[PDB]
Amino acid sequence: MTMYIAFILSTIFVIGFVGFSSKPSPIYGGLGLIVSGGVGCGIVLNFGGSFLGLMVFLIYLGGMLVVFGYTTAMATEMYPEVWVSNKTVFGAFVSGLMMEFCMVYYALKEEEVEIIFKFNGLGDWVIYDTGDSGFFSEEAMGIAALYSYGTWLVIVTGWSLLIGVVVIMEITRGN
Amino acid sequence: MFMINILSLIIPILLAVAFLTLVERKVLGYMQLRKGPNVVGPYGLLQPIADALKLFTKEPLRPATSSISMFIIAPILALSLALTMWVPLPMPYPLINMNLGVLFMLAMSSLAVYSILWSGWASNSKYALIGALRAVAQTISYEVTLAIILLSVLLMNGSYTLSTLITTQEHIWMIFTSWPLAMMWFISTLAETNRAPFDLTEGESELVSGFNVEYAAGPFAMFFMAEYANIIMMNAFTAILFLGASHDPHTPELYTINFVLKTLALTITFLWIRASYPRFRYDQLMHLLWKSFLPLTLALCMWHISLPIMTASIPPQS
Amino acid sequence: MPLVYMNIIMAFAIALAGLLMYRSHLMSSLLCLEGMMLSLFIMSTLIILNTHFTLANMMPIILLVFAACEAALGLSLLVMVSNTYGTDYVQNLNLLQC
Amino acid sequence: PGIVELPTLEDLKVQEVKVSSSVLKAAAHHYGAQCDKPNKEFMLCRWEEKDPRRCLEEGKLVNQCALDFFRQIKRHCAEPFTEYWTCIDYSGLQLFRHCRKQQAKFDECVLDKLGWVRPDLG
Amino acid sequence: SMMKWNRERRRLQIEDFEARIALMPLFQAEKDRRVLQMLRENLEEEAIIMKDVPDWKVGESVFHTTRWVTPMMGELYGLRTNEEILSATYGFIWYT
Amino acid sequence: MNIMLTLLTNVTLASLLVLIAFWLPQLNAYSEKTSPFSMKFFLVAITFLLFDLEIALLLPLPWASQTNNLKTMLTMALFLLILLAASLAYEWTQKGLEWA
Amino acid sequence: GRIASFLKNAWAKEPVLVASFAIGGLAIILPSLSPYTNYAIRINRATPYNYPVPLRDDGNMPDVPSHPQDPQGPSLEWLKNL
Amino acid sequence: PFFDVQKRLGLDLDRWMTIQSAEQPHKIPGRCHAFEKEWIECAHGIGGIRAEKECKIEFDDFVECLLRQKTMKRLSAIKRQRDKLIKEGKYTPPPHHLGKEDPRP
Amino acid sequence: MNPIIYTTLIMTVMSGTMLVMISSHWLLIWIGFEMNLLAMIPVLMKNFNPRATEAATKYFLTQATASMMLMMAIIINLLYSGQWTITKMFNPVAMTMMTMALAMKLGLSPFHFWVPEVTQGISLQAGLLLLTWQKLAPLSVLCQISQSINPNLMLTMAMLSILIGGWGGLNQTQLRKIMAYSSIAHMGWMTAVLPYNTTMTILNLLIYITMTLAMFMLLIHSSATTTLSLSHTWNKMPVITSLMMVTLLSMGGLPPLSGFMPKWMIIQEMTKNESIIMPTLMAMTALLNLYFYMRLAYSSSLTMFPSTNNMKMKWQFEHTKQMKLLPTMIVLSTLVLPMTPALSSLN
Amino acid sequence: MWFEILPGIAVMAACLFIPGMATAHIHKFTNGGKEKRVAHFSYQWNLMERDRCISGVNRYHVTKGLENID
Incomplete structure (x- = not known):
């Protein structure tokens, strides 16, 4: 079973996406997003991306959606909408799981599934490379090259964040 | 045997939390000219058992009537994350050795706020919701400085690996190198753990019980255990980061003793601070961080970037 | 393409469909936006790690930097909408027509 | 397209340097100092050819030279080297720092009996 | 003090990297031989496996180029035991 | 598998305690006990995000210090830090940091 | 003169900002005039992260050594003295 | 309207990350550096229209290295037929593939 | 909004578009689009009204979806080619997704529904920026990827845009909505020639930009957002409404006015590629645009609508602010037809 | 008096000491009397795998020295 941990995680990722995509109250949506973020971190870690996946755990889960939650709390709704609360939400939730199951089964049964692209049912372990990175974390060096090579990216991103602060101030002015 | 190691990390930490409660009570009493619990057992050693049993046998009130799933997840998440954050700590050999254990602990601390966030909301009360919001702001506000200060000090470590902190501080404590950062980091730990003078969340004097006003019996006990476990874990992180200890590879017991003693000293410092100062006003708390601390942390971060380059003391990556 | 790519592309498609089909709340749609961004981060990270494109391992980070900028903009708009109407409901964004 | 020309099993059979990582690391400096020529030749072959198959013989020569290096160590400095690598094996990171005294003993013996000089830093 | 100790640490790191450099050629030879042997075993077992399948060349390269391509994990460990596959794929990631 | 084991064990232990604390003490026999303002200061939360x-x-900096172009690395790192300080100063001076 | 008055007022009323600006200014300025920065660059260069791939000897490369421990090639004595 | 200001002023604003075979830190090679280098060297100065067909072999090899669809298809066929023969009982995996021999170091 | 901040936001918008038109790396092009959105949103809400907030929210949602689809297309093209360079796109699905995203950014139908609403919500100056400057970046991106573009999808979107722009305008009495529908139709005209000859798209874009600049500046000068408020203008500033009539006739494409040359050259290029039915349908469908232009002209200048007594007060005063480029924009929008062969400069 | 606080601190000290000693001794027991090898980089994991193959009992901590040679 440990042979397809990545696939199990990807299925959980899709399930969380169906959860927050069916639009329950933003509380449960936040829960689905949090679960999906953790699971994406798991997949990234499995592929060797410890730092990148951990970034989602902190700057995405404990970041963008940590305020998403703080926001919903300020705009409190009368009732916590759940999947079963609206027949459509529950129906779409079930259909989404069913859709995943259909493609999953087809991919496994039909060695080569083709929804919009062509996918092979072989385990993800196949695609991995047999090279050695030596005394290095390739992800770490690539990310740290943002200061040595990606100076232009640094400039543009910093300017965007400053203008984002100014923009948020201006939008929340309200005159 | 790895499961045995997990249990050895978990259960003693819970026992330490239980007895930390008694230690806090006695220390606060003695600093107030009083004697801590001493009737229940010799010198009060059996008081935590009585407290726990009384809590558990107590009525399980629950007028939440909203998202009971959340009202149950919040204690689970809090306790689970409190126990997990202990895992990567090297004492001196970590249970799980991560190249980025530091960022892992930062992420787990950020997640742990959701426990307070949900508990207060699913309670669906007045103090609970507003108090939970004040919590989010408090932890969120100090999370920024916590990260900056941590990055600034690790610039000397050369990695986010907790284990290498022992090697880096082999000859001297990092407090000598970064004491201003150490002071700000200590205050940051105080804020993150929601301890006095930043005990605004619970804030009994102002908010009847804060986020846990609608939590009783066992779930309240789990919140208490999570709080105290976070206190001990954050003090242990401080001890590892700044007050390094000598580690003899052949006898880890010496390092373990030294580390435990330093963490105990820092926890006693936490209780001491709780006794001495009054509570910062919610507004004053944020003023102290974004307007007063955040600047100095930025300046010290620039300095700690520049120093290894201008002193040719760039630490080894491995 | 391995099945993980299929799953993540499916997640992005599902999130896109959810965003394009609002129900009442704007926050749910903003949740779908953040979710689509997560799918894109995971897909980009998997591609870059598998191909050992060392110099592109920062692209996922910049994507998230701008993902949070977009989220922040969305919340900054949502608060104003709520102030003007009392709810985040989409049906109140009705003054402009055609 | 074409068939991959994988070499036979017999040609790729070579005598193996069956020593653990700590043992290799203990002798790493003197091994590099003594066995440099075949190792550098094999590396040049691998990097120019970019085919593992093309440079099998150079790898065989590297393995043989390593075996000769270790045979000489066994002949002349067996016990000090054993103590050195047992010291190194204890440390999880296999650090050189903790075993400086055993390193000095091994270096002194190897300089006396075999005349090898440990290469300097850099 | 930190400057002195960090300079010494960089010196020791250079020493350790020099040791790795000294040992690298032997490891490269061993790795190349192991990869070739694993590929040969896969090819032989594959000929036995797919002899009866029609219109299947054995060991036909999937790339047009007649140049060595580093085999993926799937080629080398395709038909080994699951424990070997789990080790080769996720050992360094999971080891802690 | 070690990290997965740790996560599983911790979560199961905490959930087990929640069970023994939500249901086990709930058996004990008893009787019947009966039983937001728009925060515009949320701007602080939004500013936290952009910060x-x-x-x-800034997290890659420890590995960024290992490059050979230390001049460019230092210039860009101080550039980012100075832009952050400028953002903080702007919000401070424009009374945008109106906490509570 | 007025600058001294501004500094005194700033230290009296906003000492934290004064400390921060002083530290940031030093962090900006000092590395430029520090002699050891080039030493840090050289140290980072000297670290042998990747293998030193040998080069074919065509008989016209006096400077490149033929073997370690030969006098030709770079030296790390400066770091050892450091 | 792609004003090639980078080429006019000789500024490498973003072309460093354009390809996987460009210079990378510590000369860490890409997984498909050889194929990409060959494809670019083939498709240099001949124009996109010519490159789409006169370098199709290089591009196909590059795509195969990137995605390995054909390699995975071949391996899937091998595993299918091995399972089929095992069910029929006319195949027995070798002891070394079963783990009965120590792999080469 | 503080004027320094307003200038910084406008420069950020322009810098985002410059990054879009300057970068050879897809990630940076998407970054430029993100900067454009971030800077644009507060600019749309310079004057704070509930309508301004609603328009900003709609625009943000639409552009955010477009950017997300664009980034997914970039990621897919990376997955199948491993190239970040803006060039031929090597996956047809990525090409289709990118085309949909860029069309949504341009307001091409059936992604047009947001253009009239956003234009009505925002002020005349924000509308000018939205309908002139914002079009530059996506059109640049499409021109760079023109070869990969599937001609059928682009042509269908162009024809639908022309049809819908013509239809919607007939029903509108709000000047801003009329301008938005005209913009939709002209965007369809520009994107029609994109598969065939990009220089024609650039020429049409320049002519359209001049005409819309002139029209919006005239509306700002007249301070009219409705047909009747513009009708009142003849009593105050007859020259303004006369020039408005001339610019409207140009926008309709009537010869010998400058508005004729983009349509003429587009028809030429399409016919050279054996497209005969499509240019014919586009030219005929432009008559709806011409119709509502003519109705606006009847309301404004050709016929004198009733004024109000209080206008006698405005007679005494004069316009304080002068828009320097308005006369030259009018001249270029109306009298540049004798100078088409200069269409080889942008070539 | 204040020394009465000490017994609780001592119990807490023992409880905190237990996990570190437990981890150290469990690592020693599992890794054959030596510290658990730390693999922060793929080279170290490659060394561990090579040691596993060399040992012959599929345990890396088992160390083969000069005796295996010739």
């Missing part, structure tokens, strides 16, 4: 972004951008 957390710079936090993320």
Whole structure:
């Protein structure tokens, strides 16, 4: 079973996406997003991306959606909408799981599934490379090259964040 | 045997939390000219058992009537994350050795706020919701400085690996190198753990019980255990980061003793601070961080970037 | 393409469909936006790690930097909408027509 | 397209340097100092050819030279080297720092009996 | 003090990297031989496996180029035991 | 598998305690006990986000210190930090940091 | 003169900002005039992260050594003295 | 309207990350550096229209290295037929593939 | 909004578009789009009204979806080619997704529904920026990827845009909505020639930009957002309404006015590629645009609508602010037809 | 008096000491009397795998020295 941990995680990722995509109250949506973020971190870690996946755990889960939650709390709704609360939400939730199951089964049964692209049912372990990175974390060096090579990216991103602060101030002015 | 190691990390930490409660009570009493619990057992050693049993046998009130799933997840998440954050700590050999254990602990601390966030909301009360919001702001506000200060000090470590902190501080404590950062980091730990003078969340004097006003019996006990476990874990992180200890590879017991003693000293410092100062006003708390601390942390971060380059003391990556 | 790519592309498609089909709340749609961004981060990270494109391992980070900028903009708009109407409901964004 | 020309099993059979990582690391400096020529030749072959198959013989020569290096160590400095690598094996990171005294003993013996000089830093 | 100790640490790191450099050629030879042997075993077992399948060349390269391509994990460990596959794929990631 | 084991064990232990604390004491026999303002200061939360972004951008610095172009690396790192300080100063001076 | 008055007022009323600006200014300025920065660059260069791939000897490369421990090639004595 | 200001002013604003075979830190090679280098060297100065067909072999090899669809298809066929023969009982995996021999170091 | 901040936001918008038109790396092009959105949103809400907030929210949602689809297309093209360079796109699905995203950014139908609403919500100056400057970046991106573009999808979107722009305008009495529908139709005209000859798209874009600049500046000068408020203008500033009539006739494409040359050259290029039915349908469908232009002209200048007594007060005063480029924009929008062969400069 | 606080601190000290000693001794027991090898980089994991193959009992901590040679 440990042979397809990545696939199990990807299925959980899709399930969380169906959860927050069916639009329950933003509380449960936040829960689905949090679960999906953790699971994406798991997949990234499995592929060797410890730092990148951990970034989602902190700057995405404990970041963008940590305020998403703080926001919903300020705009409190009368009732916590759940999947079963609206027949459509529950129906779409079930259909989404069913859709995943259909493609999953087809991919496994039909060695080569083709929804919009062509996918092979072989385990993800196949695609991995047999090279050695030596005394290095390739992800770490690539990310740290943002200061040595990606100076232009640094400039543009910093300017965007400053203008984002100014923009948020201006939008929340309200005159 | 790895499961045995997990249990050895978990259960003693819970026992330490239980007895930390008694230690806090006695220390606060003695600093107030009083004697801590001493009737229940010799010198009060059996008081935590009585407290726990009384809590558990107590009525399980629950007028939440909203998202009971959340009202149950919040204690689970809090306790689970409190126990997990202990895992990567090297004492001196970590249970799980991560190249980025530091960022892992930062992420787990950020997640742990959701426990307070949900508990207060699913309670669906007045103090609970507003108090939970004040919590989010408090932890969120100090999370920024916590990260900056941590990055600034690790610039000397050369990695986010907790284990290498022992090697880096082999000859001297990092407090000598970064004491201003150490002071700000200590205050940051105080804020993150929601301890006095930043005990605004619970804030009994102002908010009847804060986020846990609608939590009783066992779930309240789990919140208490999570709080105290976070206190001990954050003090242990401080001890590892700044007050390094000598580690003899052949006898880890010496390092373990030294580390435990330093963490105990820092926890006693936490209780001491709780006794001495009054509570910062919610507004004053944020003023102290974004307007007063955040600047100095930025300046010290620039300095700690520049120093290894201008002193040719760039630490080894491995 | 391995099945993980299929799953993540499916997640992005599902999130896109959810965003394009609002129900009442704007926050749910903003949740779908953040979710689509997560799918894109995971897909980009998997591609870059598998191909050992060392110099592109920062692209996922910049994507998230701008993902949070977009989220922040969305919340900054949502608060104003709520102030003007009392709810985040989409049906109140009705003054402009055609 | 074409068939991959994988070499036979017999040609790729070579005598193996069956020593653990700590043992290799203990002798790493003197091994590099003594066995440099075949190792550098094999590396040049691998990097120019970019085919593992093309440079099998150079790898065989590297393995043989390593075996000769270790045979000489066994002949002349067996016990000090054993103590050195047992010291190194204890440390999880296999650090050189903790075993400086055993390193000095091994270096002194190897300089006396075999005349090898440990290469300097850099 | 930190400057002195960090300079010494960089010196020791250079020493350790020099040791790795000294040992690298032997490891490269061993790795190349192991990869070739694993590929040969896969090819032989594959000929036995797919002899009866029609219109299947054995060991036909999937790339047009007649140049060595580093085999993926799937080629080398395709038909080994699951424990070997789990080790080769996720050992360094999971080891802690 | 070690990290997965640790996560599983911790979560199961905490959930087990929640069970023994939500249901086990709930058996004990008893009787019947009967039983928001729009925060515009949420701007602080939004500013945290954009500052957390710079936090993320700054984390690679320990490995960034290992490059050979230390001049360019230092210039860009101080550039990002000075832009963050400028953002803080702007929000401060424009009374945007109106906490509570 | 007025600058001294501004500094005194700033230290009296906003000492934290004064400390921060002083530290940031030093962090900006000092590395430029520090002699050891080039030493840090050289140290980072000297670290042998990747293998030193040998080069074919065509008989016209006096400077490149033929073997370690030969006098030709770079030296790390400066770091050892450091 | 792609004003090639980078080429006019000789500024490498973003072309460093354009390809996987460009210079990378510590000369860490890409997984498909050889194929990409060959494809670019083939498709240099001949124009996109010519490159789409006169370098199709290089591009196909590059795509195969990137995605390995054909390699995975071949391996899937091998595993299918091995399972089929095992069910029929006319195949027995070798002891070394079963783990009965120590792999080469 | 503080004027320094307003200038910084406008420069950020322009810098985002410059990054879009300057970068050879897809990630940076998407970054430029993100900067454009971030800077644009507060600019749309310079004057704070509930309508301004609603328009900003709609625009943000639409552009955010477009950017997300664009980034997914970039990621897919990376997955199948491993190239970040803006060039031929090597996956048809990525090409289709990118085309949909860029069309949504341009307001091409059936992604047009947001253009009239956003234009009505925002002020005349924000509308000018939205309908002139914002079009530059996506059109640049499409021109760079023109070869990969599937001609059928682009042509269908162009024809639908022309049809819908013509239809919607007939029903509108709000000047801003009329301008938005005209913009939709002209965007369809520009994107029609994109598969065939990009220089024609650039020429049409320049002519359209001049005409819309002139029209919006005339509306700002007249301070009219409705047909009747514009009708009142003849009593105050007859020259303004006369020039408005001339610019409207140009926008309709009537010869010998400058508005004729983009349509003429587009028809030429399409016919050279054996497209005969499509240019014919586009030219005929432009008559709806011409119709509502003519109705606006009847309301404004050709016929004198009733005024109000209080206008006698405005007679005494004069316009304080002068828009320097308005006369030259009018001249270029109306009298540049004798100078088409200069269409080889942008070539 | 204040020394009465000490017994609780001592119990807490023992409880905190237990996990570190437990981890150290469990690592020693599992890794054959030596510290658990730390693999922060793929080279170290490659060394561990090579040691596993060399040992012959599929345990890396088992160390083969000069005796295996010739």
